[PDB]
From a paper:
HSV has a characteristic particle structure comprising a DNA-filled capsid (~125 nm diameter), a proteinaceous tegument layer, and a lipid envelope. All three types of capsids have mature angular shells (triangulation number T = 16), composed primarily of 955 copies of the 150 kDa [name], [name], arranged as 150 hexons and 11 pentons. Compared to A- and B- capsids, C-capsids have significantly higher occupancy of the capsid-vertex-specific component (CVSC), comprising [name], [name], and the putative [name] proteins disposed around the exterior of each of the capsid vertices and implicated in DNA packing and capsid maturation. The CVSC reinforce the capsid structure to withstand high internal genome pressures and may signal the completion of DNA packing, thereby initiating nuclear egress.
The four blocks can be combined into a complete map that contains an intact asymmetric unit yielding a final resolution of 3.75 Å for the HSV-2 C-capsid. The resulting density map features well-resolved side chains consistent with this resolution, allowing atomic models for all four capsid proteins ([name], [name], [name], and [name]) and the CVSC to be built in. The cryo-EM structure of HSV-2 C-capsid reveals an icosahedral assembly of ~1250 Å in diameter, similar to HSV-1, HCMV, and KSHV C-capsids and HSV-2 B-capsid. In HSV-2 C-capsids, five copies of CVSC density are arrayed around the exterior of each of the capsid vertices bridging two triplexes (Ta and Tc). Unexpectedly, in contrast to the bi-lobed head observed in HSV-123, only a single-lobed [name] is seen lying between the space of two adjacent penton-VP5s, indicative of the high level of flexibility or sensitivity to proteases possibly due to the exposure by detergent treatments. A five-helix bundle from five components (contributed by αi from the stalk domain of [name], two α2 helices from two [name] conformers and two C-terminal helices, α36-C, from two copies of [name]) and a four-helix turn (the hump domain of [name]) make up the stalk region, which bridges the penton-binding and Ta-binding regions. In summary, a five-helix bundle in the stalk region, a large hydrophobic patch and two sets of three-stranded sheets in the distal region drive the assembly of these five components into the CVSC. We note that one CVSC contacts two subunits of the penton, two subunits (P1 and P6) from single P-Hex and two triplexes (Ta and Tc) in an asymmetric manner. The N-extensions of the [name] dimer insert a number of hydrophobic side chains into two hydrophobic cavities of Tc triplex, one within the [name] and the other at the interface among the three components of Tc, stapling itself in the Tc.
Author numbering:
A (entry chain R): 6 to 52, 57 to 122, 127 to 164, 172 to 190, 195 to 230, 235 to 262, 267 to 318
B (entry chain S): 1 to 164, 175 to 318
C (entry chain B): 100 to 109, 118 to 491
D (entry chain C): 198 to 207, 211 to 246
E (entry chain C): 345 to 393
F (entry chain B): 1032 to 1374
G (entry chain C): 1228 to 1276
H (entry chain Q): 3 to 16, 23 to 45, 76 to 97, 104 to 170, 181 to 354, 417 to 466
Amino acid sequence: FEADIAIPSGISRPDAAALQRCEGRVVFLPTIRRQLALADVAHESFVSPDTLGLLLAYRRRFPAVITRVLPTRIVACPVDLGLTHAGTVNLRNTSPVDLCNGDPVSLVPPVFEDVRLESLDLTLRFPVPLPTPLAREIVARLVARGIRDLNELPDLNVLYYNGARLSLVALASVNTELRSLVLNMVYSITEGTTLILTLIPRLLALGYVNALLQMQSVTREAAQLIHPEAPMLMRRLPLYEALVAWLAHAGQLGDILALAPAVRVCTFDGAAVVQSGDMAPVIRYP
Amino acid sequence: MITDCFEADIAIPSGISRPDAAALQRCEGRVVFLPTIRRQLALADVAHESFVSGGVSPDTLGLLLAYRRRFPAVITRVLPTRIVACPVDLGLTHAGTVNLRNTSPVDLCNGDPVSLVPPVFEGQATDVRLESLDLTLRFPVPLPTPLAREIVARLVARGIRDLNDLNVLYYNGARLSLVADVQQLASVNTELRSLVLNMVYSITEGTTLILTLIPRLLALSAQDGYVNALLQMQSVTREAAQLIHPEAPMLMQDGERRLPLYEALVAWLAHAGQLGDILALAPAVRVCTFDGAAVVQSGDMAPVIRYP
Amino acid sequence: HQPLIARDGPNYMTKVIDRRALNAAFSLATEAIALLTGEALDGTGISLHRQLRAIQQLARNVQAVLGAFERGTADQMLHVLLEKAPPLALLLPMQRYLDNGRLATRVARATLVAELKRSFCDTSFFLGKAGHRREAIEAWLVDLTTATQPSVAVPRLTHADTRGRPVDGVLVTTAAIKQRLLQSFLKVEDTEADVPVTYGEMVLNGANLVTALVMGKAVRSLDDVGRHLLEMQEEQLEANRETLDELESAPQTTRVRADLVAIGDRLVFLEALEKRIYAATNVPYPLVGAMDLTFVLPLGLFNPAMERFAAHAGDLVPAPGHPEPRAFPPRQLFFWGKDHQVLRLSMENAVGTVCHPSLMNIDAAVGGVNHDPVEAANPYGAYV
Amino acid sequence: LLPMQRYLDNATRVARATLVAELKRSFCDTSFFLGKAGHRREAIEA
Amino acid sequence: EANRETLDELESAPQTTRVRADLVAIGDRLVFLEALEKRIYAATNVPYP
Amino acid sequence: SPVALYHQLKTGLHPGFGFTVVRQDRFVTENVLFSERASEAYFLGQLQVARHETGGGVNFTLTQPRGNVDLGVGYTAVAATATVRNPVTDMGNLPQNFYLGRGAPPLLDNAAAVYLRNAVVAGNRLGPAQPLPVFGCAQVPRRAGMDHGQDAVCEFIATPVATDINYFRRPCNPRGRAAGGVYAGDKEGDVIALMYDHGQSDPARPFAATANPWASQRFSYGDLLYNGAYHLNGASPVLSPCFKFFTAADITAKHRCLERLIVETGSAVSTATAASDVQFKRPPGCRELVEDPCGLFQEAYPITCASDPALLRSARDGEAHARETHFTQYLIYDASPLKGLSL
Amino acid sequence: DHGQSDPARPFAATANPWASQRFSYGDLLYNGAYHLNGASPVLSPCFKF
Amino acid sequence: TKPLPTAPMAWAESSPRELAGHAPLRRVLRPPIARRDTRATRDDTEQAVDKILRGARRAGAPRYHLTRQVTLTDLCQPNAERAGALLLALRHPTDLPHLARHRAPPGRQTERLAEAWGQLLEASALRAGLVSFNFLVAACAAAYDARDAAEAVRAHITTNYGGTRAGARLDRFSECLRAMVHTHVFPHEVMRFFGGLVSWVTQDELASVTAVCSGPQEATHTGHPGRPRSAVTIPACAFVDLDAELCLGGPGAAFLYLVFTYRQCRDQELCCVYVVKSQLPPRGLEAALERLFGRLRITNCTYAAFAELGVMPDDSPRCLHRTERFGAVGVPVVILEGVVWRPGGWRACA
Amino acid sequence: LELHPAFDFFAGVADVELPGGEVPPAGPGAIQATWRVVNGNLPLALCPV
């Protein structure tokens, strides 16, 4: 299956040439649908959201790989369906990281650095097809970056993958782009560690439940308790009510920072490592 | 069709009354917990008498705890002689799209993952009973994941009150309440042990740096309405700063080569955000209506595309 | 239609069809698909002689599959009849009761359960017990044959002798017994029997329904409905009339080798199947069954007054000057184990049923007795 | 043998066991025969 | 053809003669009932096995 | 007291109890059928080829829908039981443990409880090798080697010493008061009225209410151990023979029609499994078909048994040669189906 | 193994301690392994037990 | 070529439904909807041209995803091991010395993993390669339960693998694995599944291995026209069931997994690679890891790490336990049958 | 621990020569052996009164 995205008329010579460039690039679309407008794809369809808003958006929208581009319409095969139908669909790196064979690949919003069409008067931002072991790392480095601006290290800004060096600095606009995640990653921990601390000395419910807990708390949790409750304390405290409020909130952030793989690269008669800027054969099917 | 579909065939016996047999024709979009992936099974292995242990059929909080030991599958078509269900994990269909049915009181959206929950709601525990065979079919309820974590959370919190209201919910302005029910303590013990081991392991030395930032948040919640709404009116940290003055130690053991907060996040994500997946089962199903609408109401079918 | 006898002084049967399904697995292998498909073929005879090897592997497997179904039936029947079959020991009381009284007085119902228990206990395994005798066993066979009341169906054809005498039924045993009976207790009065061949068919009077595409609406187009009906109902007769024309046409009886025994007044196929069918498969011969019995052994009970005595004076005498272990309350048993061992079973084995903390769980009782409100008795010893 | 053939037509851990009992008592009995049933006849013929 | 004329079976019958030995009929079959300690093992110090 | 006894029993004392031991057995017989000119109408269908694919290759699986109708009115076919082969279960003495089972509230002292258990389960043919898994069932120790066949599991119903032995010289009911829909009348409460109502008199021996005041009555010491209701031993796998006697909800559930009840003790489903090592409540997958006389009659059968070896040895000579009772001693001589088999 | 029953007569571990158990009195004498009486030509019947 | 067991012989050809389905569509009628109411060769190659036409006049059959990789022959040997073994891809080892500096707990030697890996490059030479599974068993052979069959794994590796001092490759790579867990860089963070062997191409110092990254096993045309068949083989030390150890004897499709066991001690750290066959959900698997391997729990963050490996689609899955020959060495090998490969991702500890 | 008629095997205190003093050490054990002297030293279970 292959959908259609019609380019509306009034295209200059480079605006058709810029869309000729992004051959094998990833596109989010609202629903699997035959006919579709290009304003539904563009950055104007998102409004400007933060890094938190894009990750909630990229779960709800449906990713698709652009196949061969006709001058009138953009043809794009959806990842979830037509790629289980078709055999193997190519995919161009726009990442600085070179993909190896067999890497499960997720997407990241463009936090790093974006084709703009002037005649159609819109911007196009694109996800970054980088591998999933890096994907949970590059986020967590930047979340650790934003916490230090709420009072860093000379390291933590440099990443190594497959012999290649990255620089996450390469800034204050990015820090305000990511400020809402910092306000959720801090609160989900500070709510969390207190409910651990205000329940285990509150109950330690006994027989083998607290004893196996104390076996785990033998200078490991209780020492971490006595170290935190030194700079702390020990009416009705809504303890049981806050657990529901915490498991709903902290359970939500695991969904957002999950970054599930869609792309699984099985190269055949090709390079086992695909470089940056190159196209990679991609399946999501056994 | 072994990899694309997988026709696990629940056989129907000979003696079933035509009012009971035609009661299965309204069992189209359902969820059946297959114990194995055999190609020939019976209703007795599907029905609740397979679910019961020796003398004990567990409560709803325990009724989760052997769903995840089994294989959920959705009925494709109810023939007179058999019922065919494709397992969710192996392969969905030829095209890979199966239809469920909202037995929820809750309307769905497109793209949201769908968790299936035992019948916990009030006026909802509807088990299609075979009078001709003495078999009950406890059909679970497909629910949105922003509910299905809270509904587990109300049940786990109810059992720990019972070791020393809570069963009322809201969703998009719709007030709804679940069945208040006494819980077996054997079921609560594995739940409470699953909390703490994911809570103790979620604490690292770098988290003490984060703890120092609590009076900065109440310094920030007085100006940002976003932070003032984020904490809660009944949050712990708003109360855990007026009695708590946190601090950090000066130096770290081998604090030159290791990252304090980066190790704090990864151990947090691997245990605290992971924790909702361990209580319930995983939402391996989302809804992608191709041409219908954006909101799928109750009682109606919904197309399903598999969910990584 | 029940017989009814006119006395002085002041009916349809509907049975449910059981339904079952039988299975076999035929599977091939990729190696031989390429050949059969024709794909891997070459011009070389070697490529060819590789087919014939993998063409025959169907013939072998197909036959051994199709065969498993004729053995399927012969299996099912034995598995079926066992479920129509009350054991003898329980019947002969019944057939005496149904024939004579067939009456609902509670005493009648009661006097069976006496006769059932004691018939069963005595006659259960007959050839093991009375087997040495003869005039008994000759009368036991005659009971089998007469215990069943004949059935309703009258078949189109009838298994018969060479002479043509009809055959009234089938004994089925193991071979271990069949050899026994054919020596002393019976005589084989025929060798080859005549057996029908063709199966049956059915006559179809159904519900005849139409869905007929129609172009244009007029009487003829509509009358075609009425017409297509007659067309369709005209077709069934032509279908049925063939079957009767076929059943009269086909060959009917052949000659078959099987044993015909004359028991009492009736000829009977005497057959033991464990060779033809159940030999050299993993399936047990269903006719070799099972039993459950349960036994009651008392341990430490104690003799009544009249029953403590000795059959003589010096009967069992301990060595002179020694105590008598006989006169003490006994705490043991003795009995015969399986293989002829003397087992021993004494109190000290009870620990597992007693030392358990359970015997001090009263709480069901106290609540369970106090459901009904109980009166207030003299409270002289219940009150402190 | 005469016990074996009966067993070969059914193989748990249990079935094996009773064979052993079956063999022993069948050996301790029918081992020598014409010295035992020699006076009888119907038994030898069988 | 699945079954065939077995190649083992196409030999013509050999030359049969007449020989004195005892055919006992046990059960349904015939059996040579045979004792060899005269024909063989006689005046030869080999034991009868 | 559960502690006080473990002394008085081990060290040789006789307290004021006595037990009626019970156990189950399985015998492999050889049957015979009979039938008639047409005793069954048999419908056979048409075959169905189902092509499946597998790494090994393609698979064909053939099916032929078949059906059975028994058009005889009355009994048109009969099975009988000829002889008996090897009895499968060894006739042994294996006592039952309740420590395999679970679900009883432990005596309060964590010292005293662990003291008993360690002094019972230890060194036991049966009791658990490992501590109980919190879910599932404790496993019986594996045995190095087996011989006689699987081992029967006895049970012990504590019963007052005074009840006369002469109850046991005839097939009886362990519960001491008869049960079963067979005996009952036509009313609603009948099938219950028999069992637990001690106003009336035992249908088996009308001149008394019961032979076990402890085992007969509702909520007695007897019921509490053996019922489906109380699920006391529901944990453990080991088959408990007396289960079918004391379980109340089963008896009432059965129907009363004798024309039917006969046929349906021909084919009755075992409560045990030969395939297991010792004896196990049957796993739901496998089924054995077994004829239960004791299914209908709610009775059990006595054996040759004695409290002395001496007084036993005189039994093998026959029946009328058996001295029944020496001074306090006694003998029991089996009435059974197996009476004369010399098995 | 005397922590276990006896396949022959399960209710006891052994009929003798002095014989059954490894390094019992008997096994010291009659185990061909220990090779005690191996000198003498006279048969030892129990050697195979 | 049209035999006369026809209803099966036409059924194996890919039916009557496709004939009858095209009958109401295409065979009848003008409806859909209408008005109302030169001696030896040629003809040897000439019929081969016609065989291409026989390849063109026509064309179940399952699909694959074959993969190839140019692979150095230091660690694995696709010539010594037959077709049908597991394979394991790696990350590139230049990420090894930097990640050990941040993932190892304080007080541990982070220089150890960069040194141990550097000694391996000078020991197999007397570049992200590939680890074969049989090579991995002899490395973790000093931690197992059945130690003799682990020496049977070690018996053929030191005699059949190409290279100089293959036992020095083993005892250095096993030292690398003891440096993995000590520097907390767990081997599941490095070992990535690469599909089962079908064929390979020989060249000096490197080999071009073909493998199925996803799909079934036995119907890949191996290249050998007599046998396009190759069963999956696993040595006996790594094969662990959960149907026998948990009394789950029912039929059903059996899954295949890889499992690492971690023992974190002071310079005595164990590694065991097991192949776990199960009838279980992958979410219903971590509780089963708690029941068995609690010994390495106390001596240590989790002790276990696992991922999916493949599925046996059989109702009653069939396994073999034989002694095959790798040259002249008899190794107790658990031969699996009918495996449909579907990979997945590892699961976490920290 | 009953392996022989003529000896006793008990748990001693390993690595202690004797008589050693008032309070033997808590050090580990080892099965020891002594010589029963007369009959009566046979355990009562094995020579009943």
